[PDB]
Curated annotation (Swiss-Prot):
Stated name of the protein: Coelenterazine h 2-monooxygenase
UniProt source species: Renilla reniformis
Reactions mediated catalytically: coelenterazine h + O2 = excited coelenteramide h monoanion + hnu + CO2 + H(+)
Assembly information from the UniProt record: Monomer.
A single GO molecular function term of this UniProt record: carboxy-lyase activity
NCBIfam families: PRK03592.1
Length: 305
């Protein structure tokens, strides 16, 4: 893998990004976030997933800012956000902080969500519980449905079995598996040193600080072997999304992707979905940010008219 030769010229380092962010206290902690402020009649909330932070969206967001207010948090325990008060980082812990944070943002009645990975799960669950607050949903490499079979998936069955076992703590708390192994593996280009450093920084130290990156995959909604509360959450939102004929959606497929291939047929079960494609693996924002930004912009513009 090779550096994109034109990237250093436009690179945004961690410190450059964090300087453009602000914080809001939320319950017993706080959230770090980027807010583009302008055009606040609409709000496009971008949610990262495991391993990453708001930083992931840094080259995507400029495309959408001119048409709507863009708001991009670091999920609790991730990026430069605060930690969860009880040290728990399950989907519902993340949701508790995220929804409390939304209350303080002065959002419009109908919100646009853009979700990746577990950040899409959070958007979908929010939508299920707030069905009157949703203007549109963009999703990518997302938690679309429960998992009944590994057939169309990347070969991670044993990785997941290991992660769910006591081996998960070694892989993640000790070895930083998601940052040092998964992250670069699932970006096609080579990240600039400063870009990788921005992903590493929250999790640079060994041990419990890395917990969110272990808790996320342990939420995987496997019908056989999964945590049943998350299976229920996903089943519930999946049925709601299949029935949501009047809710515009955009699915950004990654080619060849990481699990896009496994979830696309599921994404097609959600009506009113526009489909586009970019070249990438899992962390597609790092390989096609401008193409993604333009597709999202175009979709948002249509939905606002």
């Amino acid at each position: 893998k090779v550096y994109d030769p034109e990237q250093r010229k436009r690179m945004i380092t961690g410190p450059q990004w964090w300087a453009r962010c602000k914080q809001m206290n939320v319950l017993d902690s706080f959230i770090n976030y980027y807010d583009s402020e302008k055009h606040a009649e609409n709000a496009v909330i971008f949610l990262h997933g495991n391993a990453t932070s708001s930083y992931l969206w840094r080259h995507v967001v400029p495309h959408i800012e001119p048409v709507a207010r863009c708001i991009i948090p670091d999920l609790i325990g991730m990026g430069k956000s605060g930690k969860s008060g009880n040290g728990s980082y399950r989907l519902l812990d993340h949701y508790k902080y995220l929804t409390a944070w939304f209350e303080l943002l002065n959002l419009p009645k109908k919100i646009i969500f853009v979700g990746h990975d577990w950040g899409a799960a959070l958007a979908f669950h929010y939508a299920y519980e707030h069905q009157d607050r949703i203007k549109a949903i963009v999703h990518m490499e997302s938690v679309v449905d429960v998992i009944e079979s590994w057939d169309e998936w990347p070969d991670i069955e044993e990785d997941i079995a290991l992660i769910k076992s006591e081996e998960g703590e070694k892989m993640v708390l000790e070895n930083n598996f998601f940052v040092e192994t998964v992250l670069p593996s699932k970006i096609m280009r080579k990240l600039e040193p400063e870009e990788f450093a921005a992903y590493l920084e929250p999790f640079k130290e060994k041990g419990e600080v890395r917990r969110p990156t272990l808790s996320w995959p342990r939420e995987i909604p496997l019908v056989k072997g999964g945590k049943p509360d998350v299976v229920q959450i996903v089943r519930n939102y999946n049925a709601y999304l299949r029935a949501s004929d009047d809710l515009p959606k955009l699915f950004i497929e990654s080619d060849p992707g990481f699990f896009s291939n496994a979830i696309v047929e599921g994404a097609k079960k959600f009506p009113n979905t526009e489909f586009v494609k970019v070249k990438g693996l899992h962390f597609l924002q790092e390989d096609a940010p401008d193409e993604m930004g333009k597709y999202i912009k175009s979709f948002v513009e249509r939905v606002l008219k």
